[PDB]
Amino acid sequence: MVVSENVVSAPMPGKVLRVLVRVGDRVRVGQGLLVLEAMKMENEIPSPRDGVVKRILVKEGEAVDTGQPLIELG
């Protein structure tokens, strides 16, 4: 067993510009969860599935790296 962690991680290094959801929000596949500044663009990071936002692990302005947990889904 490994506990399945429903965590959305950064696809690439960057800076969190804004968070588009709140704990408890219902989300759909493809829905923007936050905006990441990377590759000289503001990239919306999508939810990979339908679900509920359980926890927000980063704050606006935070620098993240590849694979770093950003949002946990319920």
Give the total number of structural domains in the chain.
1
* CATH number of the domain to which 43 belongs: 2.40.50.100
Q: How was this structure determined?
A: X-ray
Domain that holds residue 59: 1-74
Residues 6+ apart with CB under 8 A from 73: 6, 7, 8, 27, 47, 49, 51, 52, 53, 54
Residues 6+ apart with CB under 8 A from 53: 21, 22, 23, 24, 25, 27, 33, 71, 72, 73, 74
Give the resolution in Å: 1.5
